[PDB]
Write a protein that binds this ligand. Structure first.
Ligand SMILES: C[C@]12CC[C@@H]3c4ccc(O)cc4CC[C@H]3[C@@H]1CC[C@@H]2O
Lengths: 12, 228
């Protein structure tokens, strides 16, 4: 789940 | 207080993702280009769904494990719930985006999708018949996320309870009898089985389109789909 975890932790 | 029914509804209202503006191809739809339009849209909406979920009070406080599995479990259904709301006042049509409006019969160009379109339209029509309100829609969509799939399970149950309490409160604003508020509540929740059913068929159909190489899928949609 790398992209999901990034988007859960990175704001944008 | 951040989770009073009124405050919670307002937070969900402000949390709504923006309109994903996408257009039709200049050319008429083929199997390939319809699927490319729909998957491109879905991926973009997947990006915005994660941001939406992070704005639901207490969602980021959940375990990272729970945040992942809830979004993984519910995303297609939430996507479909969004579509039906956008399409509620437009019989015979699916308003995928403001500039991407498909008639029922246009699903004939993609193999297997027409049956799913009919499920989506049929379920949308029941929601129109019930006169689904925007604030009822907001609570229900949040309930799909939170009811999908130690201290985190308690926080999840509590958060699910608060959104449910908010829906009961929205329904109670109509000033109908306590009998009729219960009937309306049941009627709305019973329709979610049909949305879930449509999402399971949509998932299956998308998996088949990917394996048969009818369309390439990328980014977040690909990842969610590889995960199952
Ligand atoms: C998942 C599919 C592509 C993406 C479609 C979509 C795309 C965006 C959206 O908001 C809702 C839906 C529901 C129907 C979905 C389709 C049903 C079958 C198809 O494979």
């Amino acid at each position: 789940h790398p992209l999901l975890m990034r988007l859960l932790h990175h704001p944008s | 207080d951040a989770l009073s029914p009124e405050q919670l509804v307002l937070t969900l209202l402000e949390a709504e993702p923006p309109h994903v503006l996408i257009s039709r191809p200049s050319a008429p739809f083929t199997e390939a280009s319809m699927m490319m339009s729909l998957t491109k849209l879905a991926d973009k909406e997947l990006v915005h769904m994660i941001s939406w979920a992070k704005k639901i009070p207490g969602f980021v406080e959940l375990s990272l494990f729970d945040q992942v599995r809830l979004l993984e479990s519910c995303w297609m259904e939430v996507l479909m719930m969004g579509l039906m709301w956008r399409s509620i006042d437009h019989p015979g049509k699916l308003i995928f985006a403001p500039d991407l409006v498909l008639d029922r019969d246009e699903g004939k160009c993609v193999e297997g999708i027409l049956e799913i379109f009919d499920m989506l339209l049929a379920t949308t029509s029941r929601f129109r018949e019930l006169k689904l309100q925007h604030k009822e829609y907001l609570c229900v969509k949040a309930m799909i996320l939170l009811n999908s799939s130690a201290d985190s399970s308690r926080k999840l149950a509590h958060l699910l309870n608060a959104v449910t309490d908010a829906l009961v409160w929205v329904i109670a604003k109509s000033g109908i009898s306590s009998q009729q508020q219960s009937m309306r509540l049941a009627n709305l929740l019973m329709l979610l089985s049909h949305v879930r059913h449509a999402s399971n068929k949509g998932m299956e159909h998308l998996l088949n389109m990917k394996c048969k190489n009818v369309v390439p899928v990328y980014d977040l949609l690909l990842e969610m789909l590889n995960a199952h």
